[PDB]
Design a protein around this ligand. Structure first.
Ligand SMILES: [K+]
Ligand SMILES: [K+]
Ligand SMILES: [K+]
Ligand SMILES: [K+]
Ligand SMILES: [Mg+2]
Ligand SMILES: [Mg+2]
Ligand SMILES: [Mg+2]
Ligand SMILES: [Mg+2]
Length: 114
RNA sequence: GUACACACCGCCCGUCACACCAUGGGAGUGGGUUGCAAAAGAAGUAGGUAGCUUAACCUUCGGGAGGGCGCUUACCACUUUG
């Protein structure tokens, strides 16, 4: 497994911040429109994390312009320019799929004080 | 006696056929308004308060009081369902 380990290690990002399910994060991703390249933000609740080395991913949910949207980011992709935690959430579960059935007041997540 | 008056060779009724018009019913179906039973909860105001932060007052100079932010509850507009 050392050959593939070396291949994966040379590609991993070194500056991924720590975040947990239930946190609010802002993800800045590259967008190409013609010749221009710019950063677009996507901010929402982390509802799932897949810890898998170079194949790590995380899922962010938001309500956007009257519509719920989920994005599954590949953590080490160069498309993802940056990740930052905006608010720390207090949940028990690793996977918050129950939030898909909730809106407004029913979907609130308590802040994690630490 | 009369409903006749170009005066019984008068007057006149209804179905049927034709034309037009408005209207009742009608499998139902589309709008408007509205009742009831719920869902919902922006902003504001009021109550509470883990957490964060404080120009005037009081300090035994460490702080205290009080305030603010944030969070939370109540009321409620949009909106949704039957
Ligand atoms: K007479
Ligand atoms: K006739
Ligand atoms: K008719
Ligand atoms: K307050
Ligand atoms: Mg005759
Ligand atoms: Mg009719
Ligand atoms: Mg209510
Ligand atoms: Mg409110």
């Amino acid at each position: 497994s050392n050959i593939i380990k070396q291949l994966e290690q040379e590609q991993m990002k070194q500056d991924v911040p720590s975040f947990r399910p239930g946190d609010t994060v802002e993800v800045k991703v590259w967008v190409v429109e013609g010749s221009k390249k710019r950063l677009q933000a996507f901010e929402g609740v982390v509802i799932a994390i897949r810890n898998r080395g170079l194949h790590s991913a995380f899922t962010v949910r938001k309500i956007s312009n009257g519509e719920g949207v989920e994005r599954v980011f590949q953590t080490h992709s160069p498309v993802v320019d940056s990740i930052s935690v905006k608010r720390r959430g207090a949940v028990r579960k690793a996977k918050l799929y129950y939030l898909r059935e909730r809106t407004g007041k029913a979907a609130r997540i308590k802040e994690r004080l630490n």
